[PDB]
Structure formats: structure tokens, C-alpha cells
């Protein structure tokens, strides 16, 4: 791991933002959603993005988020 | 599609394809859904899906951009 940030929320949902380096030396982004169940177990949902797709992934996320931000401020 | 505000599909040169969706719940709140569909060596498609709700959108965006900035500066 090169970078790792844990984003708690006020609910039982926590997000992890991880940057890791592979063997070829390439970087990848890993976004994780971890949700606590009433039993104290965790469900985790994990997405990976290769550095070669980073600009396009970022542009696409920003566009989708922008829709929500506009609605919220609307 | 009723309940879907926004939907985009992103092919890559890898076995990973992405979907960025904005959905609307019963109350009219918007929420984000990010999906990675990964083709396995065998031909089965695994699907990974994350949801982010309105109350966490700004912080999620900020944290996502901060991690991406790490990659930007390290290339
Ligand atoms: Mg919490
Ligand atoms: Mg492909």
C-alpha cells in the first residue's frame, strides 16, 4: 500500500481509499465500502482501477457526482 | 428509466468495465452507484458495486480526489 485513508461516516458504512503499487511498478486505486451488519459481521464491496484508466475514471466519477451536488444545492 | 437519473458506461482495454450511476430513492434523494464488472479468465463476469448517499457525497468526492492526486503525482 502506498496510501490508505479510512473515511468513517455516522452510519455503519465505512469507505477505504487505497493506492497500491503492483509488480510491474504500476499504481492502482482501490475503493472499498465496508458495512457492519447487526451481528457484527462486515459486508465489503471492493472496486479496482488501473493507473492507465485513472483520468477517464476520475472524469466519469466527477460527472456523476456533479449531478448529485447540483440536485442537493438545487 | 424511472429511478435512474444518470448512467454511463466506461470500457477499458482491460477485463474491467465500469458503470457510474445516479439513482433516486422513494423520498427523492439522489445516490451514487459505482460498478466494476470484471471478466474472469474463464468467461464469467464478477460484479462489484459501491453505494454513496447524499449526506456523504462531498466528503466522498474530496477523499476520492485526494487518493487520485496521489497517483497523479506518482506517475
Ligand atoms: Mg460509523
Ligand atoms: Mg475491455
Residue numbers in the entry:
A (entry chain B): 11 to 84
B (entry chain A): 8 to 82
What does the paper say about this structure?
Pur-α is a ubiquitous, highly conserved protein involved in a variety of cellular processes such as transcription, cell cycle control, mRNA transport, and neuronal development. This sequence repeat-containing protein binds specifically to RNA as well as to DNA and prefers the consensus sequence (GGN)n, where N is not guanine. When searching databases for proteins with PUR repeats in lower species, we found that a bacterial hypothetical protein (Borrelia burgdorferi B31 gene bank entry BB0047) contains a single PUR repeat. We found that the B. burgdorferi Pur-α and the nucleic acid-binding region of human Pur-α bound with comparable affinities to DNA oligomers with (GGN)n sequences.
Crystals of selenomethione-substituted B. burgdorferi Pur-α 8–105 (L17M, F27M, I64M) belonged to space group I212121 and diffracted up to 1.9 Å resolution. The PUR repeat of B. burgdorferi Pur-α crystallized as a strongly intertwined dimer. Each PUR repeat is comprised of a four-stranded anti-parallel β-sheet followed by an α-helix. The interaction of two monomers results in a globular domain that we refer to as PUR domain. It exposes both α-helices on one side and both β-sheets on the opposing side. The buried surface interface reveals a large number of aliphatic and aromatic residues. The buried surface interface of 2058 Å2 significantly exceeds those observed for average crystal packing and strongly suggests the dimer is also stable in solution. The part of the crystallized protein that is visible in the experimental electron density (amino acids 8 to 84) matches the homology region that was identified as PUR repeat (amino acids 8 to 81). Thus, the structure confirms that a PUR repeat identified on the sequence level indeed corresponds to a structural entity. In the B. burgdorferi case, the interaction relies on a dimer built by two identical monomers, whereas in D. melanogaster Pur-α, an intra-molecular dimer is formed by its PUR repeats I and II.
